[PDB]
Amino acid sequence: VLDQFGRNLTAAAMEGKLDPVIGREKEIERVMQVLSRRTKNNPVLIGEPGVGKTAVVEGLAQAIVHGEVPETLKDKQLYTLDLGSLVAGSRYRGDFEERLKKVLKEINTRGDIILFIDALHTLVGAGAAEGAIDAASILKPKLARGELQTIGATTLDEYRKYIEKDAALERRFQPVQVGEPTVEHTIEILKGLRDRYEAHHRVSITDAAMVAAATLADRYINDRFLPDKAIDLIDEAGARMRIRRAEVDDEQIAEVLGNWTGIPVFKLTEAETTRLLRMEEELHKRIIGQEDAVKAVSKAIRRTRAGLKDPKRPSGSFIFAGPSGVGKTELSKALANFLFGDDDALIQIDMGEFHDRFTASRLFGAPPGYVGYEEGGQLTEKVRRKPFSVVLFDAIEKAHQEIYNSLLQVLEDGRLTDGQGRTVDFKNTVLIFTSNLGTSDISKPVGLGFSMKQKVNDELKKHFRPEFLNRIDDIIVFHQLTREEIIRMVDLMISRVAGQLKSKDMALVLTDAAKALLAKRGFDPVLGARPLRRTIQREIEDQLSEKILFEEVGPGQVVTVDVDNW
């Protein structure tokens, strides 16, 4: 291969340009085991993007120049081969085939070339298609005879879509699994890469930072992979140190990770133990009133996270029973923003539309050949995208029996089988079920007799199966809100729009007489404290638009509104 489409990794390892490859030695030995074969000496590094597939080959190219190769791979000039640059420039017939036969002629003359084709899935249909002169069919004769040594690097998905699907190419290539490193393996990688990133940034990097880079990237980043994600934290923190300047620490990694996810450095640089020690006071910030509920779930999460925890249970299962919209999904959002630092972790499934077991095949995915195969079965993109999550099952009493027979897995194990065959882990997810099985007192202070908390408890036993209810951690019951409890919610929500008023130098001069009437109008004992915000926008914000209807802007108008008494 010329130095036109690739790069001599063997000559890069002579000049000490390749990064040290710590670990992955079972894989470098496996690649040598494939390359030492007589025929079809062609390994494929199958992994994920960033697990160190190129690093295995960089570690192999170091093992060639250090003489650690078994007199079949000695003095093999290992070249990469960018097939993307090799396709690039083919707008005419025969351009790609000419640039590939020049490479293939160069390997024939020298006889000591090992190709490394990153993205070997590109080989299929690189020229035109499968049955056509592509890069696959050009290389297939010499790959089948061991006369072209080629290290591939696909992912597991791309190996199955392109190499296993292509008949007469799955045989030419030998799968070498490069798994994602563990966190303790990644710390050993970072400590081996310590001298490279200390010398580049001229910034000392401590052992506290490299443990923090591997641990927090596995937790907070779940679209990328360990080796890379954690190196990128070490690399970006050393780079942002250069734009501040001598030492990268635990807190410096949490800052450059907080700029990616949006978690405040504090929620990254914390300590589960303290992290959940002042849990109650931070969950009061968006739940005022119904305080025994907050202290119950704050106690339950601190039991089922801190200290002992089996890995065969979720972080907490909850039944939120009681009156609707009094803080039911408002607490679960407040728990999700406490969970690891992101409010965007709450998922409403809205089980009220389900009154069918056939629609459970439209919730957990369809059997293939049926409708509901793409949307439905979307739990892959949600909960194994985010192992730290909160799933809310609103109105579970509306659903069919067969729907939560499939939910008996996730309370026992913490795993779920998708309709497309995925392991959708509910392992760290706080699952929360929800039923307004209580509406009797709710429906006026009368009942079925001739004349609270335990009325809705035995309605769960009446409606559901006891097999489902007892795996659930704690059942939380909400009560009717006192008028002193409602006006604090009015106080919290009138202050939300008040910040948008002084942006325009307007001021809603607050009075408590209007706040009592908002509590009367924005609450009923069937639905209340959910339509309180529409009561705010219909009764306050309609009449504050009458200011600019009669054109009141000025430097600022101190408006005070009070509607009549009821």
């Binding site: 083919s90 005419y92 017939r93 351009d95 020229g127 050949g369 049926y370 409708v371 195969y373």
Partner: peptide, 24 residues
């Protein structure tokens, strides 16, 4: 109940040979 997933065949062809203009 069933859905058939069809298969939208794309038009894919090899690159065009060109004819050259000569400059002596």
């Amino acid at each position: 109940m069933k859905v058939l997933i069809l298969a939208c065949l794309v038009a894919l062809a090899l690159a065009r040979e060109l004819e050259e203009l000569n400059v002596p």
